[PDB]
Each structure stands twice: as structure tokens, then as C-alpha cells.
């Protein structure tokens, strides 16, 4: 009788003092919302042009009154944005909100601070900005969300997040579900607390160690079910919550195989029955429903709470099988002239800090040359009252070398931008920035990021 998850059972959120259990909503079960693929304004093989518009509106979530929500090219979350490697991407960023926002491309190898779209890329109500870039990184699932400093939390809670899919030649060649909306779906995992008139009140539910409500919400849907019409289904899991951790497993321990992480395909497929994700992490998995019959419903659960029902229909057999090797991880060579960087995440509540300091806009906390790989030792110092801190770094994809001198977890051998650090643990990352800019590095529990557990590094060309 042990935990089924890789992380440290005592550190789990369910052990927190102000832990909010998930509760099942009485709302009607309804089809999972699959956000439309965002149609480009114009597209050639060399160039793509998109308009992305932050906007306030209303969404039917619970029965009765509609919930006031924000979203991208929609009233909640966003239309899914497809980018291609090597394709000159051109984006118009339009803000029609009553408040100034930011357009952060979490996981995008792009310049900073302006394209990156973090704390220093404000966009006022009414005005537009124009960005352009060519991603040179592997196929993966990234995402877009707001990133004012503060409050990233409030804006994400309002509903500013959208899945971003990055396509490439290698990933296209592999035998994988790719029919978006049919056998390949977003699974954006969030929670909310609904107040009177089914409205949200971030500030009423504020907690300095993380905001979480009882009602799970997947792709802006309550009590979702999904209609399976293929044997294999591809799930792109994104933890878009402000603090909650998802411990994912089917009711009957139905196996699934993870094929992707944050920043790339995994080098090899990894079989799971139980998958934990901290804030901002992604995991792409293939589920096989071949043992089931028409009419059966297999339910996906987080801990002991049902999240997502899969209604099984008729499907043609799928004989295909995954290769031993999905992707070639080309590790950089550490620059020997560089020392080891030590980053200590510390404190809790309003005490949060990185290397003894709260985030300041005008202060540069670190530098690193472009093109030069470096070992980062990252430490979560919190003691017994412990929390798994998802450490994130803008403008790169790192490799995970060790966890307390031991091997990294079996699903951490590919490229990642976010790694959960257990209380007391030091992890070692191999980090390289390709481009010049100012990039944030922070805990992706968003309430702590708004509270000062954020710092910034400047990359430069020698």
C-alpha cells in the first residue's frame, strides 16, 4: 500500500491546511467543449498570420445565469492556435478587455521581453500590438495565457488561457491520433468556485498559497463526457489550475502511454495507470479503449472524484503499435567555463521569495550567455508544511538531469519548461537560451508568482 504517483505523498496538496476538496456538480452532464481550431487570416507554406483578441463575455456553465468570463477569440479560454516549426508566424494581439493584459506564449522559444509577452509586454484596453517569430523547437503542446505582474492569477481565473499546438516534420511521421476534435483532444484541467448567479469572485476566494474551488472545469465545461469513435484516443493534458494538482487515473486502472511532455516528445513511450501533474505541466497520452463495448462509459478520475466520462461507440480495430523510440533527445554539452547556478525557492504565504528577494520589475537577478548550456540546481526549501513547487523558466526548454542526486521521474527524459520540486529537494536542470532577452523564472503556483516568487535573468551574446 504505497502511492501510485512519482511525487512525495506527504507533500501533496490534499495535505494542505486550507485544502479545498473537489465536489461533483449537479449540473447536467454535457459534451466536452472542444475549442475550435483558430482559423488564420492568411496562410502560405512559409508564413502564417493570426489575430488573437482578448475579450470579455458570458458563458453558459451552470443552469441559470451565464458566467462572466474572459477568453481569446471566444468568451472562455480560447481557440486552439496551430504553429509550425520553421514557419514565419505573424500575430496581431488585440485587447478588448476593460483591463490591461499581456500575451505570454508559455513554452515558446521566442525573444524577450516583448515577443515572449511577460511582465514587460503590456497591452492596454483598445490597442493592438504586432509580433512575429519563427519557432525552432520540436513539436509539442504549449499554451497562451495572460501574464501581467500582478495579477496573472486573476486574469487566468477570468478565463484567459488557450492551448497552442506546435507541429513539425518528425511528429507528423509517427503513427499517432491527430484528427483534432475526434481522436486528439485538449484536456485543459482547471477548478473554479461558483458564487451567486453562477459568477466567479477571484478576490473573495483569494488565498496567498493558492486559489482552488470545488468545481472541476475541463475546457470550460462542467460534468463533461466525450464520445469515443476510435479505438485509440490522444489526450493532451494541461494543468491550467492556479494551484491544484491532478492525480489522474481511470476508475478501473485502464493503462495509458505518455508520448509527450512540456517541450517535446518523450524519447520513449512510458506506460501509466496513474499520472500526477503540477501547475503548467503538459502530458500527451494515448488511451486504448479496445477492451470496451458500445454503450460502456469509462470514467477518468482525479483522486476519488470523477472528471471526464468517455462514452464508447463503435470503432474500427486499430492494429498500429508505437515505435520503441519516439524522438532523439540531443543533449547540449554543458559549458565547462560556467559554474553551477543555485536557485532557492523559499517561504510560504506572503513570505515567498527566490534567493532571498521578492520580484522587482526594474532589477535583473541573473545573466547567462546565449548558446551556452549550464547546470541549474533548483531547491524547494519549504519544510514539513511542504508544497510541490512547479518551477518554470521563460524562453527555453531544459533537460532534467537529477532529483536529489537520483534519476529523474520516468516521464522526465524529454524537454520540459516546468518541473515540480518536492519539499526539501534539489533538482538539477541543464539550461540553454537560444535568443537574447529578459526571461522570468518562477514558481507556477500563480498566487506565489504574483506574491514575489519570481525573478528574472538576462541573456546576452558574447
What is the binding site for a copy of itself (CB under 8 A)? Answer: 98-100, 120, 122, 124-127, 150-151, 196, 203, 206, 208, 349-351, 358, 360-362, 451-452
From Cu ion, a copy of itself, Ag ion, none, interface partner of 84 (C-beta below 5 to 8 A by class): none
Residue 443 interacts with Cu ion (CB under 5 A)? yes
Distance in angstroms (rounded) separating the CA atoms of residues 388 and 12: 7
Residue 106 interacts with Cu ion (CB under 5 A)? yes
Give min distance, CB of 224 to Ag ion, in A.
30
From a copy of itself, Ag ion, Cu ion, none, interface partner of 389 (C-beta below 5 to 8 A by class): Cu ion
3-class DSSP assignment, residue 284? strand
In this structure, the number of other CB atoms found within 10 A of the CB of residue 46 comes to 9
What lies within 8 Å, CB to CB, of 31 at 6+ separation is 221, 224, 225, 226, 227
Nearer to a copy of itself, 67 or 89 (CB): 67
Distance in angstroms (rounded) separating the CA atoms of residues 343 and 348: 16
Of the ranges 58-66, 232-240, 320-328, 388-396, which one interacts with Cu ion (CB under 5 A)? 388-396
From Ag ion, Cu ion, a copy of itself, none, interface partner of 125 (C-beta below 5 to 8 A by class): a copy of itself
Q: Which of 174, 334, 348, 370 binds Ag ion (CB under 5 A)?
A: 348
Give min distance, CB of 439 to a copy of itself, in A.
16
Residue in this structure with the C-alpha cell 542526486, named with its chain if needed = 405
Distance in angstroms (rounded) separating the CA atoms of residues 397 and 403: 18
What DSSP element (H or E) covers 323?
none
CA 401 to centroid of chain Cα atoms: 21
From a copy of itself, Cu ion, Ag ion, none, interface partner of 21 (C-beta below 5 to 8 A by class): none
From Ag ion, a copy of itself, Cu ion, none, interface partner of 358 (C-beta below 5 to 8 A by class): a copy of itself
Nearer to a copy of itself, 206 or 375 (CB): 206
Nearer to Ag ion, 117 or 210 (CB): 210
Nearer to a copy of itself, 120 or 311 (CB): 120
Q: Which residues pair with 342 in a beta bridge?
A: 377
Q: Which residues pair with 87 in a beta bridge?
A: none
Nearer to a copy of itself, 65 or 340 (CB): 65
Give min distance, CB of 97 to a copy of itself, in A.
10
Residue 300 interacts with Ag ion (CB under 5 A)? no
Give min distance, CB of 388 to Ag ion, in A.
10
Residue 245 interacts with Ag ion (CB under 5 A)? no
Q: Which of 185, 387, 421, 440 binds Ag ion (CB under 5 A)?
A: 387
| Residue 216 contacts residue 305 (beta carbons within 8 Å) | yes
Residue 434: all three cell numbers together: 537560444
From a copy of itself, Ag ion, Cu ion, none, interface partner of 452 (C-beta below 5 to 8 A by class): a copy of itself
Distance in angstroms (rounded) separating the CA atoms of residues 273 and 398: 26
Residue 184: all three cell numbers together: 486528439
DSSP label of 171: H
Residue 277 interacts with Cu ion (CB under 5 A)? no
From a copy of itself, Ag ion, Cu ion, none, interface partner of 361 (C-beta below 5 to 8 A by class): a copy of itself
Distance in angstroms (rounded) separating the CA atoms of residues 26 and 290: 31
From a copy of itself, Cu ion, Ag ion, none, interface partner of 100 (C-beta below 5 to 8 A by class): a copy of itself
Residue 110 interacts with Cu ion (CB under 5 A)? no
Distance in angstroms (rounded) separating the CA atoms of residues 160 and 298: 30
Please state, in angstroms and as integers, the Cα–Cα distance from residue 263 to each residue in 137, 143, 378, following that order: 8, 11, 19
Distance in angstroms (rounded) separating the CA atoms of residues 54 and 97: 6
| Residue 139 contacts residue 154 (beta carbons within 8 Å) | no
DSSP label of 174: S
Give min distance, CB of 441 to Cu ion, in A.
8
From a copy of itself, Cu ion, Ag ion, none, interface partner of 409 (C-beta below 5 to 8 A by class): none
From a copy of itself, Cu ion, Ag ion, none, interface partner of 458 (C-beta below 5 to 8 A by class): none
Distance in angstroms (rounded) separating the CA atoms of residues 154 and 160: 9
Residue 108 interacts with Cu ion (CB under 5 A)? no
Q: Which residues of 26-44 are buried (b: 16+ CB within 10 A; e: fewer)?
A: ebeeeebbbbeebebeeee
Of the ranges 185-193, 202-210, 267-275, 452-460, which one interacts with Ag ion (CB under 5 A)? 202-210
Residue 14 interacts with Ag ion (CB under 5 A)? no
The 204-243 site mask, x for binding Ag ion (CB under 5 A), equals -----x----------------------------------
Residue 321: all three cell numbers together: 503499435
Phi and psi dihedrals of 9, rounded to 5? Answer: -50, -45
Q: What is the DSSP string of 124-172?
A: -TT-EEEEEE---S-SEEEEEE---SS-HHHHHHHT-EEEEEEE-HHHH
User: Where along the sequence are the contacts to Ag ion (CB under 5 A)?
Assistant: 209, 348, 387
User: Where along the sequence are the contacts to Cu ion (CB under 5 A)?
Assistant: 106, 280, 389, 394, 440, 443, 445, 448
Amino acid at each position: 500500500n504505497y502511492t501510485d504517483y512519482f511525487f512525495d505523498e506527504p507533500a501533496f496538496d490534499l495535505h494542505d491546511g486550507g485544502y479545498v476538496p473537489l465536489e461533483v456538480s449537479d449540473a447536467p452532464e454535457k459534451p466536452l467543449n472542444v475549442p475550435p481550431l483558430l482559423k488564420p487570416d492568411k496562410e502560405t507554406a512559409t508564413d502564417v498570420y493570426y489575430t488573437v483578441t482578448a475579450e470579455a463575455g458570458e458563458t453558459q456553465l451552470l443552469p441559470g445565469a451565464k458566467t462572466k468570463t474572459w477568453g481569446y477569440n471566444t468568451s472562455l479560454l480560447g481557440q486552439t492556435i496551430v504553429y509550425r516549426r520553421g514557419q514565419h508566424t505573424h500575430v496581431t494581439l488585440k485587447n478588448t478587455l476593460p483591463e490591461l493584459t499581456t500575451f505570454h506564449w508559455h513554452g515558446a522559444n521566442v525573444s524577450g521581453p516583448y515577443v515572449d509577452g511577460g511582465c514587460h509586454a503590456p497591452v492596454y484596453p483598445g490597442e493592438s500590438k504586432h509580433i512575429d517569430f519563427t519557432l525552432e523547437q520540436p513539436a509539442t503542446t504549449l499554451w497562451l495565457h495572460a501574464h501581467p505582474c500582478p495579477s496573472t492569477a486573476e486574469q487566468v481565473w477570468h478565463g484567459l488561457a488557450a492551448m497552442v499546438i506546435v507541429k513539425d516534420d518528425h511528429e507528423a511521421s509517427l503513427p499517432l491520433p491527430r484528427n483534432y476534435g475526434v481522436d486528439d483532444i485538449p484536456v485543459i484541467l482547471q477548478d473554479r468556485r461558483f458564487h451567486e448567479n453562477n459568477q466567479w469572485d477571484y478576490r473573495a476566494d483569494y488565498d496567498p498559497d493558492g486559489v482552488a474551488g470545488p468545481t472541476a472545469m475541463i475546457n470550460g465545461t462542467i460534468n463533461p463526457y466525450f464520445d469515443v469513435t476510435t479505438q485509440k484516443v490522444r489526450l493532451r493534458f494541461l494543468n491550467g489550475a492556479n494551484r491544484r494538482e491532478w492525480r489522474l487515473h481511470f476508475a478501473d486502472d485502464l493503462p495509458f502511454t505518455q508520448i509527450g511532455g512540456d517541450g517535446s516528445l518523450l524519447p520513449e513511450p512510458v506506460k501509466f495507470t496513474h499520472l500526477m501533474l503540477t501547475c503548467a505541466e503538459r502530458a500527451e497520452v494515448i488511451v486504448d479503449f479496445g477492451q470496451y463495448h458500445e454503450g460502456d462509459e469509462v470514467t477518468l478520475y482525479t483522486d476519488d472524484v470523477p472528471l471526464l466520462k468517455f462514452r464508447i461507440h463503435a470503432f474500427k480495430p486499430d492494429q498500429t503499435t508505437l515505435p520503441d523510440k519516439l524522438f532523439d533527445v540531443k543533449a547540449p554539452v554543458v559549458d565547462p567555463a560556467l559554474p553551477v547556478r543555485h536557485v532557492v525557492m523559499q517561504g510560504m504565504d506572503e513570505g515567498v521569495a527566490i534567493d532571498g528577494k521578492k520580484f522587482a520589475m526594474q532589477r535583473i537577478d541573473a545573466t547567462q550567455p546565449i548558446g551556452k548550456a549550464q547546470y541549474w540546481d533548483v531547491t524547494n526549501s519549504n519544510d514539513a508544511p511542504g508544497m510541490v513547487h512547479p518551477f518554470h523558466v521563460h524562453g527555453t526548454q531544459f533537460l532534467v538531469l537529477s532529483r536529489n542526486g537520483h534519476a529523474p521521474y520516468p516521464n522526465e527524459h524529454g524537454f520540459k519548461d516546468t518541473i515540480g520540486v518536492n519539499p526539501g529537494e534539489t533538482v538539477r536542470l541543464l539550461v540553454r537560451f537560444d535568443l537574447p532577452g529578459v526571461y522570468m523564472y518562477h514558481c507556477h503556483i500563480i498566487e506565489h508568482e504574483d506574491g514575489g516568487m519570481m525573478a528574472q535573468i538576462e541573456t546576452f551574446d558574447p
